[PDB]
Ligand binder design. Structure first.
Ligand SMILES: Nc1ncnc2c1ncn2[C@@H]1O[C@H](COP(=O)(O)OP(=O)(O)O)[C@@H](O)[C@H]1O
Ligand SMILES: [Ca+2]
Ligand SMILES: [Ca+2]
Ligand SMILES: [Mg+2]
Lengths: 160, 371, 26, 57, 57
C-alpha cells in the first residue's frame, strides 16, 4: 500500500531525479511519457522476468488511483521502489498481540481511544487529532470507536 | 531455509521454491540420446540431452519419456531428470533444502519407495515428503471440500474430499490422459494424408493439439456442421512450411475424453466417472460435492470443456441440485501452487520425513504415519 | 493462506537483465 | 584476372544491395506490426481486468 | 590500376555484406518478437470473451 510512499517520503529529491533520468534513458523512444502496466510487463518479459497480465492489472490498480493505468511522478517513484521488497516479515505476531492485549488496560476486550491518546503522547510525533482520526479510520474497520483484535491484526498486518 | 516444491508430473516437470506464485522452471521431461553417427570432431556432442535442450535438437534425437502412466518405468533417466532439475534449472544444491514430491493416487508402492530412496541416498536431501496430486489442487482453489478431477498428461484421477476428510473408497483413477489424446490425434490425422511417425513428430502433433483442438458443446451437431460448411477448417504451419488444414479432427481428438470407446477403452468418460465417484460418497455430502466440482491439470485446458462437462453432469444429476464447475485460469500450475501453499504452512512443518527416521526404518517409512 | 513472492528477484538483477551492456550504474 | 574479379565483385555488390534493401523493408514492417500488436495486447489486458472485477461483483 | 580498383570493390563488398547479415539477424529477432506478440494477443482475446460470457450467465 502506502508503504512505498512512506519509504520514498523518507527518501529525497535524489531518488526523484534518479528515476526521472532512468525514465529518460530506458523509456527512450516511448510515445506515452509514463510507464503502463502492459509496458512494464513487456519490459519484464524483455529482461527475462515473467509476470502475468492479471498480475499486471492487479499491480497497476494498486499503484494507479485515477484509473489512468500509468504512473504519476509520486506514483512512478512508488512503483519503481515497489518492484523490490527489501523489508518483510512485519514485526512479530505474538509479541504484538500481547502488546495489544495489555493495551486494553481495562481488559474488556475493547480499546479505549484515550489509551491510544496516551500512547501517542508517548510517541510524540508531529501529529494532529485528525491524523490519529484518519489512522483509526484505517484501523477501525467496523467503525465501533475502538480497536477490535481482528482489526488490530488487520491494521498491523505486516507492519514492521 | 526454504523448501523445494518439485512436481514430477508426466510431460512437464514443474519446480520452484516454496512460497511463490508460479514454478520457477517448467520444461518437458524427455531424455533423448542421439541416433545418427556424427562426423564433426570436437563439436562437444553430449550423450544425452534432457529437458528443454532436447526440444531444440529433437531433429536428430530419439526422445523417450521416463514416466509412462504416473508410474516411473526407467529409473536411470528419471534420476538424470532430477539431477538436471536441481543443478541447472534451479542451481541449488539439494543438501540444504527439503523437497515435496507429488504422486498420483493408487500408484504402485515400489515406485514411491524407490523415489524416496533415491532422494535420500543419491541427492541426500534433508527431508522429503510425498503428497497426492489432487489434495494440492484442492489447496490452490482455497476450498476445503469438493471433488477434484485432475486430468494430467499421464493419468486422470478423481479424488473426492469433504471437510478435509478424504474418502479413500471413492477414488476413480482412469488411465486416459493427454498422451493418449496425442496418439489418437496423430492417428486420425492420417485420414487427410499427413503422416507423423517419428518420436520427434509426436511433439509437432502435440503442438497441433494444444493450439487448435477444442471440445464441442454438442458432438452430433458439430459433426453435422463440419460436414456441410467449411467455417471450422483452421490451418497451421509445420516447422518447415507446407501448411495443413484440420477439419473435423479439431473436436474429435478431445472428444475421446467423454467417449473412451474411440481409442478402444471400455470405461466411461470423464463426465460419468465424476458422477460415479460422487454417488459412491455418503448421501449427505453429495450436494456439496455437486456444487464444488473442481477442474485441474493440463488437459482440462481445452476451450469449451467447462461447459460440456457441466451440461453432461446436469443431465446425469438430479434436477434440483446445482452443478457448478470451478475452472480457475491458472489450471495448469494448480497442483504446484497448492504444493507451494502446503509447504509454506507452519502446521505442516513437522510432517516431513526426517533423514534420521529413514535411517531407522528404511525406505518403507513412507507408507507409515508420515504418509 | 499466505502468499510468498520470489519472482520479484532483487531489483539489481532486474535492472541488469533489462540493461545488459548499458548496465553500468543502474 | 582483373576483369573476372571486377565482374564477380559487381555481381556480389548487386546481390548484397538487394538483400540489404529487403532486410530494411522487413525490419520496418516487423516493427510496425509489433507496435500495433503490443497496443492491442494492452487493450485486451485492460478489458480483461475490468470485466473480471465486474464479474466478482 | 585494375588491382587497386578490385581491392577497393572487395572491401566495399565485404563491409556491406557484413552489415546486411547483421541487420538480417536482427530482423529475425524482430519476427520472433512479433510472433510472441501475436500469441499474447490471441490468448488475451480468448480470456476476455470467456470472462464476458461467464459474467452474462
Ligand atoms: N493449452 C493447452 N491446451 C490443450 N492441451 C494442453 C494445453 N496445455 C497442455 N496441454 C496438455 O496437457 C499436457 C500437460 O499436462 P500437465 O498438467 O503438465 O501434466 P502433469 O500432470 O504431468 O504436469 C500436455 O501434454 C498437453 O497435451
Ligand atoms: Ca494512476
Ligand atoms: Ca481498553
Ligand atoms: Mg499433474
Amino acid at each position: 500500500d502506502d508503504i512505498y510512499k512512506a519509504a520514498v517520503e523518507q527518501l529525497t529529491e535524489e531518488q526523484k531525479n534518479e528515476f526521472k533520468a532512468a525514465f529518460d534513458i530506458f523509456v527512450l523512444g516511448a510515445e506515452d511519457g509514463c510507464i503502463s502496466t502492459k509496458e512494464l510487463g513487456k519490459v519484464m518479459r524483455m529482461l527475462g522476468q515473467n509476470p502475468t497480465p492479471e498480475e499486471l492489472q492487479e499491480m497497476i490498480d494498486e499503484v494507479d488511483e485515477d484509473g489512468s493505468g500509468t504512473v504519476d511522478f509520486d506514483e512512478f517513484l512508488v512503483m519503481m521502489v515497489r518492484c523490490m521488497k527489501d523489508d518483510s516479515k512485519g514485526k512479530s505476531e505474538e509479541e504484538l498481540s500481547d502488546l495489544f492485549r495489555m493495551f486494553d488496560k481495562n481488559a474488556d476486550g475493547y480499546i479505549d481511544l484515550d489509551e491510544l491518546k496516551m500512547m501517542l503522547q508517548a510517541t510524540g510525533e508531529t501529529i494532529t487529532e485528525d491524523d490519529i482520526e484518519e489512522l483509526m479510520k484505517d484501523g477501525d474497520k467496523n467503525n465501533d470507536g475502538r480497536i477490535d483484535y481482528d482489526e488490530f491484526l488487520e491494521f498491523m498486518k505486516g507492519v514492521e | 531455509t526454504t523448501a523445494l516444491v518439485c512436481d514430477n508430473g508426466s510431460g512437464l516437470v514443474k519446480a520452484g521454491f516454496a512460497g511463490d506464485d508460479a514454478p520457477r522452471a517448467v520444461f518437458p521431461s524427455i531424455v533423448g540420446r542421439p541416433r545418427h553417427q556424427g562426423v564433426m570432431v570436437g563439436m562437444g556432442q553430449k550423450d544425452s540431452y534432457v529437458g528443454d535442450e532436447a526440444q531444440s535438437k529433437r531433429g536428430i534425437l530419439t526422445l523417450k519419456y521416463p514416466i509412462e502412466h504416473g508410474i516411473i518405468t526407467n529409473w536411470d533417466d528419471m534420476e538424470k531428470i532430477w539431477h538436471h532439475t536441481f543443478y541447472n534449472e534451479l542451481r541449488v544444491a539439494p543438501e540444504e533444502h527439503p523437497t515435496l514430491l507429488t504422486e498420483a493416487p493408487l500408484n504402485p508402492k515400489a515406485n514411491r519407495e524407490k523415489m524416496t530412496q533415491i532422494m535420500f541416498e543419491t541427492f541426500n536431501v534433508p527431508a522429503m515428503y510425498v503428497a497426492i496430486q489432487a489434495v494440492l489442487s484442492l489447496y490452490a482453489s482455497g476450498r476445503t471440500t469438493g471433488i477434484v478431477l485432475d486430468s494430467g498428461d499421464g493419468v486422470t484421477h478423481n479424488v473426492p474430499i469433504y471437510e478435509g476428510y478424504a474418502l479413500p473408497h471413492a477414488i476413480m483413477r482412469l488411465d486416459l490422459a493427454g498422451r493418449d489424446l496425442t496418439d489418437y490425434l496423430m492417428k486420425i490425422l492420417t485420414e487427410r494424408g499427413y503422416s507423423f511417425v517419428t518420436t520427434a513428430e509426436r511433439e509437432i502433433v502435440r503442438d497441433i493439439k494444444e493450439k487448435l483442438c477444442y471440445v464441442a458443446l454438442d458432438f452430433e451437431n458439430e459433426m453435422a456442421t463440419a460436414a456441410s460448411s467449411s467455417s471450422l477448417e483452421k490451418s497451421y504451419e509445420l516447422p518447415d512450411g507446407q501448411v495443413i488444414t484440420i477439419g473435423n479432427e479439431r473436436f474429435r481428438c478431445p472428444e475421446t475424453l467423454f467417449q473412451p470407446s474411440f481409442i478402444g477403452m471400455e470405461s466411461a468418460g470423464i463426465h460419468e466417472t465424476t458422477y460415479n465417484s460422487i454417488m459412491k460418497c455418503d448421501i449427505d455430502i453429495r450436494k456439496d460435492l455437486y456444487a464444488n466440482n473442481v477442474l485441474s491439470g493440463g488437459t482440462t485446458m481445452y476451450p469449451g470443456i467447462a461447459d460440456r462437462m457441466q451440461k453432461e453432469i446436469t443431465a446425469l444429476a438430479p434436477s434440483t441440485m446445482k452443478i457448478k464447475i470451478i475452472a480457475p485460469p491458472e489450471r495448469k500450475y494448480s497442483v504446484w501452487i497448492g504444493g507451494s501453499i502446503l509447504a509454506s504452512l507452519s502446521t505442516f512443518q513437522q510432517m516431513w520425513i526426517s533423514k534420521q527416521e529413514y535411517d531407522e526404518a528404511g525406505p518403507s517409512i513412507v507408507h507409515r504415519k508420515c504418509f | 493462506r499466505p502468499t510468498l513472492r520470489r519472482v520479484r528477484i532483487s531489483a539489481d538483477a532486474m535492472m541488469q537483465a533489462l540493461l545488459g551492456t548499458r548496465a553500468k550504474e543502474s | 584476372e582483373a576483369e573476372k574479379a571486377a565482374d564477380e565483385s559487381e555481381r556480389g555488390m548487386k546481390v548484397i544491395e538487394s538483400r540489404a534493401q529487403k532486410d530494411e523493408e522487413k525490419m520496418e514492417i516487423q516493427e510496425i506490426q509489433l507496435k500495433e500488436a503490443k497496443h492491442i495486447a494492452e487493450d485486451a489486458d485492460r478489458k480483461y481486468e475490468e470485466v473480471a472485477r465486474k464479474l466478482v461483483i
